[PDB]
């Protein structure tokens, strides 16, 4: 929170006038209003087909192929406009027009007077209107050309042409997932993304506040924690505004220091006492606290600006092997942690809608027990919401520059361009103790990678580390891997049948196109994704078919088995994948998988989808993602019972397998779990054919279940649903 | 080729009004208009000198010492003048004035409106002048101030000064040489060098095609190409228009692709069947396919642009055998090659004669067998014409940037400067496939050589290498420093020669042919100094000239005093010595990797190490080097206990032959046998006994039906010019 004076919300009924593009872009009021185009009523914070699709203008688009029929808005121009009240200002006070989102190349003019150029959809725009405002009615005009076109202003590399990410993408700042992925729907889109607000700032006023531990001692409940502090502030003010801080959690105040402003920026150092650590999730608590930095004038108590926020006592470091060669480790107040989480995508295709998802989407990490997320570089950055929420239920947060599967200009244009946007990235979530670790998501001799980026966490995040950059689930590629850390893995999973029935037209929701099994009809092929309406047959659906053919033998022709068949080998690899990284400790640190939930109506690699519909492979990866898990791997000439704890805590309990058919019980004993290790139980003997182990332990009076698929494919799907049913853990 | 929709030429008679140039520099038209100076008609592309000389004006500086007298215009201003009727223009079209090359510093002017200011003469410079253009009758004004005026604009550093390039050229983007070198005379010039026209382009565009080889299967007949095609392209043509890629070869079509544009830029990989590989000469055939990118109305089935080369279907990887200097080879198709050639220097000091020497100079490199050329960096970048004979005719081209024995700025306002010029010769020049390597031509911290270059070619064409960067005492050429240098790969070795007669007459005035002042042997009269080359009129005796009368006499003891006498020993010298240079390299493979020598062809009358003169006049050294150029070669290298005869593979083929060698003087044999030539190595034949006194050895091998020659001169210097005259002329290989 940041107080200010006064902060006047922009949003709600706008007037939205949009065309087709020029040879020559409409820069002026003049142009936009001289032009020949539609006018409809619009919502900020909005997307433009929104608006389109309130007025009646555009089909939904996300059913069958009506994503194509947006195709000719892409060459469009976009005018928003409406009228505004200006609030008093007195002396020395500035009024501030922010923008928390503009996709993306606008002309901003306030009453006839251009105020601002913005080219960047991913950080915020701030224009000072103090001097162009005035009485009665204030025109708010924003005219935002075309994207796309944007790009023939420049000349690319030959290394940008040619990637997955699209090369209309690679001069210009944007989300790359917008023009289009494997895992999202080519949906360019325009308008005001985020708020839109004017705020009154007094001539004191707080520009910054940086938060930074220094130290922490988990133990003693002690923590040293530096403010980075700049302000606003007239000379004659100088000796006479004092900054107030004060630290505070429940209600009760842990420390107040006081201390008179001499100059504009300073450096308070506060070593805490009473104060816990935070901690991501099972190796403790994510205890947060309320910092408040105030300015204070000494003689009449008046408070010019007030800005707050949760802190977090935690020092984060990487540990990076560079003999015995994702090869690192995060350390995390002075303790190795094994990372287990989800790459987080785009929420939405319409990017304004992302904030409404948030809340539901962090929750579903809760219930998984991620205690890491990667923020995807296709995606845009998240709001501070997001991070708030990692913050308080303890989920670390790998964050990517903006930045998609292909490389970009080594030259001076684009390197300022993407310098102003990390450092206001890295300014807004420098405070975050989720936030972990910065990436290039990028070769050694790349300038974005290794030196403009670099050079900007060198100077304005020093206390984060910043790093440059198909088949059956148990071949070598996957099993023999020598990565520690594994960032990117998933496996094909088609979505529920109600999903199913919500997004494909009702001749096309069965998946056979004239009923031949592995031919896909063309609903079908549009949601894998395709970009743009290439009529072909094979592609990416065909990973659904081939893996469960791989496992069970053939691809069922009811469109319900096909469901079963297709969740269960998503189920099986995802978590045989946890449960090989968890079980290979110490030397395996982490496994990020992709992903947890889609940002758009699709076939994906997802485990939940952009409805909510929670596929097998969520239930059973959120039973190898506790905080202390029995699991069974492949041994030699047998399978091994193991136990793994992410905890800092020591555990005993008692484990029972079993197998599903013959009830026979091929393990029974206590077992202790030593705290942040594998602790391996004991060695089983080889099972006879095919079937399934089922794990039953309990600690502390609780009871948990897991289960170990044994045997080799492709087994009958007919008799894996009975193990399953006879198992009585999924449904 | 690139269709566009028209293109008209504005080359032809010009108007060319000069003076000098004001404290102040004029670049407006009403102060050129204003000012006081001469008007005479000019021809476009040209030189002001060569306008000035049709005028009667000046006199030809390629005679005597009238190279200095053209030393005032470097402080004059140049305004070119004409008029042109403007082309029509349908909607959404472009009318782009492009200029091949300006020199260098002017302000242009179409309809009394600037439309841009040009600084560099390497470049192209194209401006859209279709908002400026008006209906029937359009005024073309050009501009140009002093080069040399335009270096006091700026402060240089310590290291910009007292190099041998000027310091004039240090803070300028143009050719080093243009200011005098020793072997180039000081003549600035100035001028629209280049094709000027006008040139219609569509709405939709190609903006550039670049074609990369991804990979060649020579055996297979098989290749990967990849296209990667920008344009310009309105989003109402999206899913409209249509890229049409025709691979071709004498009408045969290879490979025809049609695709959808839904993007501005693509990459198209093409796995191509029933492809040859380009090779370097000796190596194979210079294989090359037409390529065409045409973009097509997919519904009216209207052309809007077209662009056509001619590539070729090769890969090339420098092998950095390690950092020694030249301590590499280059790999082409997988196989190492032994590279052979010239290097390349200006065409002409008027560089705007360049294109009408391209032709006859290349084929003077055919004729020699030469697989490689350094296009040094003191000299103007080649246009598109040059690069098309060397894709022809198999020869690989080695590219140093502009920049010659000099230090440079570290500051931004040169690097923006380095920068825009790098791409633009890069992005060019990308498609040839006879260009194999980009040079610095430049320690280590260098932000020029080692950071500005380095990401153009980064960025722009990671397809080619890109290197950052024997002369000395020129003495004796069996001296321990040629004979000992370690350098697998050579870029520059030579050797001095006098000119041959006619060229002397033609560039002298009569009472200065002969060289000797007063008649004193090896005092040069002060024409002779002038054509050393000598940059500035600074009288002087010695210097430069007097390598041609040290290295006679090191090898015929005393300088001979007729005219006729002295150039046949100093070809003599100049073209044993360089021969000797190849056969050493050629005669020590597998280590030595390649033999750049300098240089073929001279750009200016004058005397030098060239071993052909600017009027064409071949020396000696011209056919000595013939003789040991070939593909497969019989030569003699001394052994510490006699000669060892070798032969040479520069193919990838087996030969088999026959050689004999004889002494001259006596005919008795030393050697005849058969031999086998093993593909692309050296192979030793036999050791040859050691020979008594001096004298001269043939060497005359057959190999499938026909016969070739060579020799060897043994024993050691001092020799007598009269002996080796007769040795030479009863070997019967040379002309005297």
């Not at 033998?553 to 469109?559: C, I, K, Q, S, T």
């Not at 939940?608 to 000439?637: E, R, T």
Request: charged share 25%; aromatic share 12%.
């Amino acid at each position: 929170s940041h107080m200010f004076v006064s902060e006047q919300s922009l949003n709600g009924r706008w007037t939205l006038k949009f065309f087709p593009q020029p040879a020559v872009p409409v820069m002026t009021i003049e142009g936009a209003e001289a032009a020949n185009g539609i006018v409809v009523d619009a919502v900020v914070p909005g997307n433009v087909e929104i608006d389109m699709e309130a007025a009646g203008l555009v089909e939904d688009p996300m059913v069958g192929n009506n994503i194509y029929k947006l195709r000719p808005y892409e060459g469009y121009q976009w005018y928003y406009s409406r009228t505004f009240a200006a609030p008093v200002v007195t002396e020395g006070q500035r009024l501030v027009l922010h923008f928390g989102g503009i996709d993306t190349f606008a002309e901003v003019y306030v009453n006839g007077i251009k105020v601002g150029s913005a080219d960047n959809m991913l950080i915020e725009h701030d224009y000072d209107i103090t001097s162009v405002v005035k009485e009665g009615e204030n025109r708010l005009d924003v005219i935002i050309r075309s994207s796309v076109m944007e790009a023939q202003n420049h000349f690319l590399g030959t290394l940008s042409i040619g990637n997955f990410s699209n090369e209309e993408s690679a001069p210009v700042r944007r989300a790359p997932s917008t023009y289009g992925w494997d895992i999202m729907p080519r949906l360019v889109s325009a308008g005001l993304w985020r708020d839109v607000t004017l705020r009154v700032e007094n001539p004191v006023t707080i520009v910054d506040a940086n938060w930074v531990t220094l130290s922490v001692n988990p133990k003693a409940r002690e923590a040293s924690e530096s403010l980075y502090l700049q302000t606003r502030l007239p000379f004659e003010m100088h000796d006479k505004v004092k900054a107030v801080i004060t630290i505070s959690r429940d209600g009760r105040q842990i420390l107040r220091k006081e201390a008179l402003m001499r100059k504009f920026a300073n450096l308070f150092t506060l070593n805490l006492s009473g104060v816990d650590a935070w901690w991501p999730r099972g190796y403790g608590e994510p205890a947060l606290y309320t910092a408040e930095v105030s300015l204070v004038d000494v003689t009449s108590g008046k408070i010019y600006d007030t800005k707050t926020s949760k802190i977090g006592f935690r020092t984060v470091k990487l540990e990076l092997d560079e003999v015995n060669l994702g090869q690192f480790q995060f350390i995390i107040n002075g303790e190795p942690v094994f990372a287990k989480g989800t790459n987080w995508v785009p929420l939405d295709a319409l990017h304004s809608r992302d904030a409404s998802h948030v809340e539901e989407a962090v929750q579903l990490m809760v219930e998984m027990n991620c205690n890491i997320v990667r923020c995807w570089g296709g995606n845009v950055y998240e709001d501070t919401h997001f991070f708030e929420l990692c913050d308080k239920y303890g989920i670390m947060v790998w964050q990517d520059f903006a930045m998609g599967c292909g490389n970009y200009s080594q030259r001076d244009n684009f390197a300022a361009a993407l310098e102003k946007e990390a450092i206001s990235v890295v300014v807004k979530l420098r405070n975050h103790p989720s936030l972990i670790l910065w990436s290039g998501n990028n070769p050694n001799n790349d300038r974005v990678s290794r030196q403009v980026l670099s050079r900007v966490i060198y100077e304005f995040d020093p206390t984060r580390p910043y790093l440059p950059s198909r088949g059956y689930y148990k071949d070598p590629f996957y099993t023999e891997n020598p990565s520690q850390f594994v960032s990117e893995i998933g496996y094909h999973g088609c979505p529920n049948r109600e999903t199913l029935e919500r997004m494909f037209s009702p001749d096309s929701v069965n998946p056979w196109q004239n009923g031949v099994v592995g031919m896909w009809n063309d609903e079908w092929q549009t949601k894998a994704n395709r970009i743009y309406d290439d009529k072909f047959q094979g592609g990416r659906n065909d990973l659904m078919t081939n893996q469960v053919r791989i496992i069970f033998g053939e691809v069922p022709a009811d469109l319900d088995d096909f469901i079963f068949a297709s969740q269960s080998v998503q189920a099986e690899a995802m978590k045989f994948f946890v449960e090989l990284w968890r079980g290979r400790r110490p030397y395996r640190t982490g496994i990020i998988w992709w992903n947890i939930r889609d940002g758009w109506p699709l076939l994906s690699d997802a485990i939940s989808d952009y409805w909510g519909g929670k596929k097998q492979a969520f239930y059973y990866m959120q039973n190898v993602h506790h905080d202390v898990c029995c699991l069974i791997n492949p041994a030699a000439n047998g399978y091994m019972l193991k136990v793994d704890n992410n905890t800092l805590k020591d555990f005993e309990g008692v484990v029972e397998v079993k197998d599903v058919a013959s009830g026979k019980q091929v393990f029974k004993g206590k077992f202790v779990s030593k705290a942040n290790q594998m602790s391996e139980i004991a060695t089983l003997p080889m099972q006879k054919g095919q079937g399934m182990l089922v794990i039953s332990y309990r600690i502390e009076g609780n009871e948990y279940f897991n289960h170990y698929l044994y045997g080799e494919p492709p087994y009958k799907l007919d008799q894996y649903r009975k193990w399953v049913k006879k198992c009585g853990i999924y449904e």
